[PDB]
């Protein structure tokens, strides 16, 4: 098996920690949802190729511009996350997260991931966002942002229900394997 490194980036409320927890356990924890994620090395076989995929979170590093880049050396694939219940998290993608990742991880594929897709049809979410003249992120808004920033692709998932989680990490593995 070949070893590859994945790092997830995004705002504090984007759901990146929960996404790594749910993938690494293949389960949304029923008793206790961890506050933090240390690291994990997943055994993944995608399109007949075996990979050891090391997983890392940048949660807690958002306010520390000299500590945060220490997470980037030798990254093979970036998951760049935003929450579908937060159009504000999508707005910070192009001029904050994208120039940083392009600088520290040149030529590394970026997959833009819309997290918490289950909240797109949540009535409480729609009511709260409508108070700030907002609505949940539409799929075309996610795809257009991914297209604009030069992302390898656009994907959505829900850590809560596990829908789309396996597909995100299998695609990230394929991206990490490309020349």
């Amino acid at each position: 098996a070949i070893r590859k490194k994945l790092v997830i980036v995004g705002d504090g409320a984007c759901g990146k920690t929960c996404l790594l927890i749910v993938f690494s356990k293949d389960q949304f924890p029923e008793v206790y949802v961890p506050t933090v994620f240390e690291n994990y090395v997943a055994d993944i076989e995608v399109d007949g190729k075996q990979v050891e995929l090391a997983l890392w979170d940048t949660a807690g590093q958002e306010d520390y511009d000299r500590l945060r880049p220490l997470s980037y050396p030798d990254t093979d694939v970036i998951l760049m996350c935003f929450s579908i219940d937060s159009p504000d998290s999508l707005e910070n993608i192009p001029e904050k997260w994208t120039p940083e990742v392009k600088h520290f991880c040149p030529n590394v594929p970026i997959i833009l991931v819309g997290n918490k897709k289950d909240l797109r049809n949540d009535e409480h979410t729609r009511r709260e966002l409508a108070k700030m003249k907002q609505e949940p992120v539409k799929p075309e808004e996610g795809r257009d942002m991914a297209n604009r920033i030069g992302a390898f692709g656009y994907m959505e998932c829900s850590a809560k229900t596990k829908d789309g989680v396996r597909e995100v990490f299998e695609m990230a593995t394929r991206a990490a394997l490309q020349a």
Binding site: P29, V31, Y32, P34, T35, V36, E38, N39, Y40, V41, A54, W56, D57, A59, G60, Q61, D63, Y64, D65, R66, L67, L70, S71, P73, D74
Partner: protein, 245 residues
């Protein structure tokens, strides 16, 4: 880690670690607070374990088996003895607070009501100055350590055999040399996340809410100071590249 502590922190949560008859005696808010305190101690136990892999398995193994040039082992593992001393002491204090809180006749049933004071002590005075000095030095030597490791692995046969030998066991799957270095660099930024969540469930006693609020502020001050004191060292960097930063 030692077996006694590994077993005490084997469960996924405090609610699964204690006896169910003891769990049933507490309110939901107490269970939520104890589950996050348990995660802080459990992740601190694992962080001290990462430092023991670095000092005992890697560093000491290279000194005792390999013929590396002087200053190479220190370059791969900067500040590891100082980091081990800071966190082993902090872990000792957390584990003693848990041990004092055990019910008589039990080695697993406890409630920690007063964590705030322990965190203020850890993140103030000489211990905070030592944490700041040590992480500012370690994090500034992080890139150099990774580059030195990659160079040795690619060019030295005995070094490659040593690494492949000691990292072969499944229990070392997440703990290669580069993985250990990044686990240590990321530890300090996990503290505000854990402390904020403990504070969310610690409103029952006003002195505890105040103490955890003070501790959270001290941890953020330490992180801000470390972040401002970092400049990556690079082997072969010339003075002109440095003064033109």
């Amino acid at each position: 880690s030692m077996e006694m502590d590994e077993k005490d922190f084997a469960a996924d949560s405090w609610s699964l670690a204690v006896d169910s008859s003891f769990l049933q005696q507490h309110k939901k808010e107490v269970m939520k607070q104890q589950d996050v305190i348990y995660e802080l101690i459990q992740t601190e136990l694992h962080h001290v374990r990462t430092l023991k892999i670095m000092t005992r398995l890697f560093r000491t193994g290279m000194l005792e088996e390999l013929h590396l040039e002087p200053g190479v082992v220190q370059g791969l593992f900067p500040c590891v003895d100082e980091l081990s001393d800071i966190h082993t002491r902090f872990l000792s204090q957390l584990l003693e607070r848990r041990r004092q809180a055990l019910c008589p006749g039990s080695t697993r049933n406890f409630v920690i009501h007063r964590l705030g004071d322990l965190l203020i002590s850890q993140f103030s005075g000489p211990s905070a100055e030592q944490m700041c000095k040590t992480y500012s030095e370690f994090c500034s030597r992080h890139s150099k350590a990774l580059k030195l490791y990659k160079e040795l692995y690619a060019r030295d046969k005995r070094f490659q055999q040593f690494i492949r030998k000691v990292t072969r066991p499944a229990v070392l799957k997440r703990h290669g040399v580069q993985e250990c270095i990044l686990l240590v660099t990321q530890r300090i930024t996990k503290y505000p996340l854990l402390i904020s969540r403990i504070l969310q469930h610690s409103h029952g006693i006003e002195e505890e809410r105040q103490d955890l609020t003070t501790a959270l502020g001290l941890v953020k001050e330490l992180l801000s100071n470390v972040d401002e004191g970092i400049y990556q060292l690079e082997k072969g960097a010339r003075l002109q590249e440095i003064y033109n930063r």
